Design a protein around this motif. Structure first.
Motif, short mmCIF file in Angstrom:
data_model
loop_
_atom_site.label_atom_id
_atom_site.label_comp_id
_atom_site.label_asym_id
_atom_site.label_seq_id
_atom_site.Cartn_x
_atom_site.Cartn_y
_atom_site.Cartn_z
N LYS A 84 -51.90 19.56 -28.55
CA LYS A 84 -51.42 20.90 -28.88
C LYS A 84 -49.88 20.77 -28.89
O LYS A 84 -49.25 20.08 -28.05
CB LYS A 84 -51.86 21.94 -27.84
N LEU A 85 -49.27 21.38 -29.90
CA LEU A 85 -47.81 21.36 -30.03
C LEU A 85 -47.28 22.56 -29.24
O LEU A 85 -48.01 23.52 -29.04
CB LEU A 85 -47.44 21.52 -31.51
N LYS B 128 -53.79 17.13 -34.39
CA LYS B 128 -55.00 16.65 -33.75
C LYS B 128 -55.40 15.28 -34.32
O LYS B 128 -55.70 14.37 -33.55
CB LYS B 128 -56.18 17.60 -33.95
N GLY B 129 -55.42 15.17 -35.66
CA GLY B 129 -55.75 13.91 -36.31
C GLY B 129 -54.73 12.83 -36.01
O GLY B 129 -55.09 11.67 -35.73
N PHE B 130 -53.45 13.19 -36.02
CA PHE B 130 -52.39 12.25 -35.76
C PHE B 130 -52.57 11.69 -34.33
O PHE B 130 -52.46 10.49 -34.10
CB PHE B 130 -51.04 12.95 -35.85
N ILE B 131 -52.80 12.58 -33.38
CA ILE B 131 -53.00 12.18 -31.98
C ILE B 131 -54.27 11.36 -31.76
O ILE B 131 -54.25 10.39 -30.99
CB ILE B 131 -53.00 13.42 -31.04
N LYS B 132 -55.36 11.72 -32.42
CA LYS B 132 -56.59 10.96 -32.25
C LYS B 132 -56.31 9.51 -32.68
O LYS B 132 -56.60 8.56 -31.94
CB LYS B 132 -57.73 11.52 -33.07
N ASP B 133 -55.71 9.34 -33.86
CA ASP B 133 -55.41 8.00 -34.36
C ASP B 133 -54.21 7.31 -33.69
O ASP B 133 -54.15 6.08 -33.67
CB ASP B 133 -55.18 8.02 -35.86
N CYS B 134 -53.25 8.06 -33.17
CA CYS B 134 -52.08 7.45 -32.53
C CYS B 134 -51.83 8.08 -31.16
O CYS B 134 -50.89 8.88 -30.99
CB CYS B 134 -50.79 7.63 -33.35
N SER C 172 -50.24 7.45 -28.47
CA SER C 172 -48.86 7.50 -27.99
C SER C 172 -48.00 8.55 -28.70
O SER C 172 -46.92 8.90 -28.21
CB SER C 172 -48.21 6.14 -28.20
N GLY C 173 -48.45 9.02 -29.87
CA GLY C 173 -47.66 9.99 -30.61
C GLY C 173 -46.52 9.32 -31.37
O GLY C 173 -45.65 10.00 -31.91
N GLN C 174 -46.52 7.99 -31.39
CA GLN C 174 -45.50 7.19 -32.07
C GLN C 174 -46.20 6.19 -32.99
O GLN C 174 -46.72 5.18 -32.53
CB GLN C 174 -44.66 6.36 -31.08
N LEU C 175 -46.21 6.47 -34.29
CA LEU C 175 -46.83 5.57 -35.26
C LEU C 175 -45.86 4.42 -35.53
O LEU C 175 -44.72 4.63 -35.95
CB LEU C 175 -47.13 6.37 -36.54
N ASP C 176 -46.27 3.19 -35.24
CA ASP C 176 -45.37 2.07 -35.46
C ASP C 176 -45.69 1.33 -36.76
O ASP C 176 -46.76 1.54 -37.35
CB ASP C 176 -45.43 1.11 -34.25
N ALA C 177 -44.75 0.50 -37.20
CA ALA C 177 -44.89 -0.28 -38.44
C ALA C 177 -46.26 -0.95 -38.57
O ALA C 177 -46.89 -0.91 -39.63
CB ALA C 177 -43.77 -1.33 -38.54
N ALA C 178 -46.74 -1.54 -37.48
CA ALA C 178 -48.04 -2.21 -37.47
C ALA C 178 -49.19 -1.22 -37.61
O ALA C 178 -50.20 -1.51 -38.24
CB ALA C 178 -48.20 -3.03 -36.17
#
Ligand SMILES: [Ca+2]
Ligand SMILES: [Ca+2]
Ligand SMILES: [Ca+2]
Ligand code: NA
Length: 182
Positions: free
Chosen positions: A4-5, A29-35, A37-43
């Protein structure tokens, strides 16, 4: 949790994008489920692409796109950057999507796209993924410069790129979608 933001952040991201409050929260929600940490890295960004292109090597193109998403160049895509880039690329006006595309091609951010910068991106696109006249990244780049470089100096200014793109029907069509449709 965190999925939740804060209220002020929902208000801010809704006002900076073409999404509704409910859409911004659904993307988080989708961003958090997949990441987690909340930080999408290059890999992690490399995988989203490897998904869609198991046949080619999307490493170079995914890296080029990652750098434009990463507006703060800290090496991680945070949600605010992620949603704003999704907003422009999926729902922006044609002029907005063209300014974003220019940022993608202008590798060193100096305000001109040189032939070599364009070749780097196009080669990445071919590596990621024809008629003889477009079967090499060099032929595609030569046609683009033949059509857009008006003062014939080997570089495209933002104006040459915008006008040149609007003159080509296939480019206009590709940048005129909203959620993938006209
Ligand atoms: Ca970042
Ligand atoms: Ca440049
Ligand atoms: Ca020029
Ligand atoms: Na035209």
């Amino acid at each position: 949790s965190n999925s939740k933001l804060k209220p002020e952040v929902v208000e801010e991201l809704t006002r900076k994008t073409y999404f509704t409050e409910k859409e911004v929260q659904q993307w988080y929600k989708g961003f958090i489920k997949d990441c987690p940490s909340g930080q999408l890295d290059a890999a992690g960004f490399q995988k989203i692409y490897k998904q869609f292109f198991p046949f080619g090597d999307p490493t170079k193109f995914a890296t080029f796109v990652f750098n434009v998403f990463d507006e703060n160049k800290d090496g991680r895509i945070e949600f605010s950057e992620f949603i704003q880039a999704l907003s422009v690329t999926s729902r922006g006006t044609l002029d907005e999507k063209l300014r974003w595309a220019f940022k993608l091609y202008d590798l060193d951010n100096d305000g001109y796209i040189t032939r070599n910068e364009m070749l780097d991106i196009v080669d990445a696109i071919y590596q990621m993924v024809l008629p003889e006249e477009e079967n090499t990244p060099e032929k595609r780049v030569d046609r683009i410069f033949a059509m857009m470089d008006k003062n014939a100096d080997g570089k495209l200014t933002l104006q040459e790129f915008q006008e040149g793109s609007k003159a080509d029907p296939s480019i206009v069509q590709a940048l005129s979608l909203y959620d993938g449709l006209v």
